[PDB]
C-alpha cells in the first residue's frame, strides 16, 4: 500500500 514500504 505505502509506496515506501515493501
Amino acid at each position, epitope marked *: 500500500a505505502n509506496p*515506501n*514500504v515493501d
Partner: antibody
Amino acid sequence: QVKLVESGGGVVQPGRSLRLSCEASGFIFSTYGMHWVRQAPGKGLEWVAVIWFDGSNIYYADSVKGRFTISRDNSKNTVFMQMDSLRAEDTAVYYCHRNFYDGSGPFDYWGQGTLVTVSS
Amino acid sequence: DIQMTQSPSTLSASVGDRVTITCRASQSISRWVAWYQQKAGKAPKLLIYKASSLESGVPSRFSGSGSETDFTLTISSLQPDDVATYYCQQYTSYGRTFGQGTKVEIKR
C-alpha cells in the same frame, strides 16, 4: 557502502539559476525514489522534491513548484535538480536523501549537504 | 500536502529527565511517522520509524507512540549526547513533510 554526494552549491545571484547534482554510490537507483531536502540557516528541514527510479512520481513542495526541476540521469546513478528564479528564501543547505522500508529494516541515508547562497 | 505540527519549539532539562515531544498530522497518516535527530552541523539521523520501531543503533531510551494523527517521541533519560533538534516526519506517499522541529538543550 551507501553514500550520497551533493555538488553544485555556492553563491548565485537573485533571479538566476543553479544546477545541483547528487551522485549515489553503493546501491542501484532501480527501486523507490530519491528526495531533495533543504534547510535554511537556523531553520527546520523542508522536503522539496522527489523522483522515482524510473523518472515517474515526481512531486514538488508548493514553495518551489514551477521553479525547481528534478530529474535523474538515464545513464548514471545520479539525480539532478535545476533551480530557477532563485530568491533569498531559497538560501539553504540542500540535502540529497533516500528512504524506504523493507522486511530487512529501514534504509535511510543523507548526503552531507551543499550550501546554496542566493546573494548579489 | 499533509501538514505536521510539532511541539514544543525549545526545551531544556537535566540529565536523566524524561523529554516528551509531540507531533500532530493534519490528517490520518496511520503509523507512517518517523522521528529524526539532527545535531549541530551534521546531517539528520533516523531514530524511530513506523511510529514505534527503533532504527539500528538507537539507544533504548528513545521511544515512540501514537497512531492516525497524534504521535509522541519520548526520551526516557536525557543525556548530554542527546542535545540536538528533533523532527517528526510523515511518509504516507511519495513525498515527505517534516515538523518544525524541537531543539533540546540540557541543564548542568
